[PDB]
Symmetry: C2
Subunit: 340 residues, 2 copies
């Protein structure tokens, strides 16, 4: 009757420590009448470590020093297994009933981890393989949103075979200045450049291509940055909106008309890309007042200071409640899958 | 110096026996100076079985009785491991250097297996997570092709929440008759109906929805069925075209102009969906002579009688050669990934 929640967290990414803090916060909130936690952390080298709740972190109360305890207690997965799918290299691991994956980095976010969980017949929180993969490839994601008649910033995408052919003059005739250059898989922070003159382009394009084989060159979007949390599978619900001041203000200072249409666009975007469980949708609200999709993020932060849970808190859904609902959604999808 | 090729084959699908026959054919052709095979078959129940080359099948020479030898020799995967990633439940399995996955069925084809292989740091043949996932969701696939300015049959997509609202009259005003109804993930053979009158619709829609949570309702396309094999990663090449007579005729009886533009459309489709390694592209050539994309299939058959290898054979690429090139492409991608 308690159900066992396998928290998988950490990962090879710059957001590793944010994942560590999400895990702790989630662990502290997990409804102890419904759920028991099993903790599997992933190293900055990609190695998996089973840990006790009481000792999964080093320097937990020091944000400059917080690290995973690399217990060396390894995990094996039995593809196709229907019970004890996750097994200790070496004696026994509690049966996991649902996985709540919060692994930032390429593999944890792009559908690879989701595929592994599917192979092991484990229910899990968040978007499936397709929704994760599409959302993470910003090129594919913009193309799908564009097809759904949602507004995205004008953009061109280069691979290395085609990046050597890039003409700044033509790109700036089409997209303007400044240009935003970023790798297609990742590209919030890492490998990103705001190019202000055509001279700076060649370097931005080269830096982006060190992080991915595909690079986006995007027009600027002038407008207010608004963020909206979505939750659900087939009938998603949208939270109150928050405004980024440059630092988030909840609820945003916008009309009810305007919050409602942002909420509507957030749900439509989430449906188009095939998201499930949760996502944060970031938009620009222009002068204007056209609404343009900036990003759909299928792995939001789950720390107590993160935007996604704060948006739900401001909509009257408490953290504990939010975690419980995400786990319910994961089980609902899983069971529905089981009849197909 | 020999490199070890893990053939993973079988799967929970109607195409299980076609996979068994592909494995045998591949094993027989594998260049024995470059590659040694390791054989992992997946049951109709989804269970994995390591087998010897000499004894992986029951009734091998009987197409009515050919089955996997369910040796009960289990496999474990060590996510994040960098060597001996695939391990025997129970003593030792050869190091696999590249996986050639030919598992038909939802998990083997929709990016889930590819995600598992990525998690285990194994190079593998065929499309990655995104390309597999997009190709397999026929809805998402048509939307992406439509956005790439490729012609697809007019269509509407329903989920169960929306399928109860389906109005035949409006669908037939928009799409015509006959209508083709099919589940979005799968839907070549299974769950498919040609509805010839509006009365037959309700049953088609209900049958499709037993196989997936999303169902496509597609217009008919009048035209000749032409199939073209694609091979490659970043610069794909296209084979000579074959014609389905209703039974394939290679090379198809069409102009060079027409074969060339089909070949061009096949490559463009393959690029749009983010395919890698191989795919077969099926098109309709209309009166006309507009070319409409019917399907992009990222897991073609590999038996000696299968269309995909026959199209390459007719283009001057022998079976052994084709397998070797697929494995080279898998290694090339893997290494390129390793610098990002």
């Amino acid at each position: 009757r308690k159900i066992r929640v396998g928290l998988i967290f950490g990962g090879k990414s710059a957001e590793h420590e944010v994942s560590l803090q999400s895990a702790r916060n989630i662990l502290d909130a997990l409804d102890p009448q419904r759920f028991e936690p099993v903790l599997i952390g992933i190293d900055k080298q990609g190695q998996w470590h089973v840990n006790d709740p009481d000792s999964f972190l080093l320097h937990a109360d020091d944000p400059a020093r917080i690290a995973l305890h690399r217990s060396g207690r390894g995990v094996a997965l039995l593809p196709g297994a229907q019970q004890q799918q996750l097994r200790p290299i070496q004696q026994a691991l509690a049966q996991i009933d649902v996985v709540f994956p919060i692994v930032h980095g390429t593999l944890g976010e792009d559908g690879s981890l989701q595929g592994l969980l599917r192979m092991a017949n484990l229910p899990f929180v968040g978007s499936g393989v397709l929704g994760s993969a599409v959302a993470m490839d910003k090129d594919m994601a913009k193309r799908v949103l564009r097809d759904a008649r949602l507004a995205v910033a004008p953009f061109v995408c280069f691979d290395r075979h085609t990046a050597a052919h890039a003409d700044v003059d033509t790109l700036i005739a089409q997209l303007g200045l400044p240009l935003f250059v970023k790798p297609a898989n990742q590209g919030s922070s890492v490998g990103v450049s705001q190019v202000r003159t055509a001279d700076a382009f060649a370097a931005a394009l080269a830096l982006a291509l060190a992080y991915d084989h595909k690079v986006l060159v995007e027009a600027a979007v002038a407008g207010r940055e608004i963020e909206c949390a979505v939750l659900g599978n087939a009938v998603p619900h949208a939270s109150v909106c928050g405004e980024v001041v440059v630092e988030i203000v909840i609820p945003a200072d916008i009309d009810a008309q305007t919050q409602q249409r942002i909420q509507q666009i957030a749900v439509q975007a989430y449906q188009a890309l095939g998201c499930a469980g949760m996502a944060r949708v970031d938009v620009f609200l222009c002068a204007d007042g056209r609404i343009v999709i900036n990003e759909v993020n299928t792995l939001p932060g789950f720390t107590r200071i993160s935007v996604y849970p704060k948006l739900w808190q401001a909509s009257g859904l408490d953290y504990r409640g939010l975690i419980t609902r995400l786990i319910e959604l994961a089980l609902e999808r899983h069971t529905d899958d089981q009849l197909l």
